[PDB]
Symmetry: C3
């Protein structure tokens, strides 16, 4: 079932965005590649 995100971090070095779910104790985390770049 859907669970609100307590914390959401991202990494540009690997383009991998991690997430912290509140499912259970809070150890489970999601990860999905995401393009990154600088914006003017």
């Amino acid at each position: 079932a859907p669970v609100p995100v307590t914390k959401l971090v991202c990494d540009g070095d690997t383009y991998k965005c991690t997430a912290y779910l509140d499912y259970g104790d809070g150890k489970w985390v999601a990860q999905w590649d995401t393009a990154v770049f600088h914006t003017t």
Copy 2:
């Protein structure tokens, strides 16, 4: 146009992360697969 997210949920059972946009009334929602696992 870009719209701030009022609510952001995720599902590990299906690896599908849902989102709630503030565009219009607030019925529109995004969805994108995302790997999930336990972290020590």
Copy 3:
């Protein structure tokens, strides 16, 4: 290294979700396609 998201926007017209990282000054931003639709 992981960095908390200060702002998170999304676009349904292009299905592209943008993000604002706190890495450095705060110019860097992530982007990843995401399906969108209406929910009843």
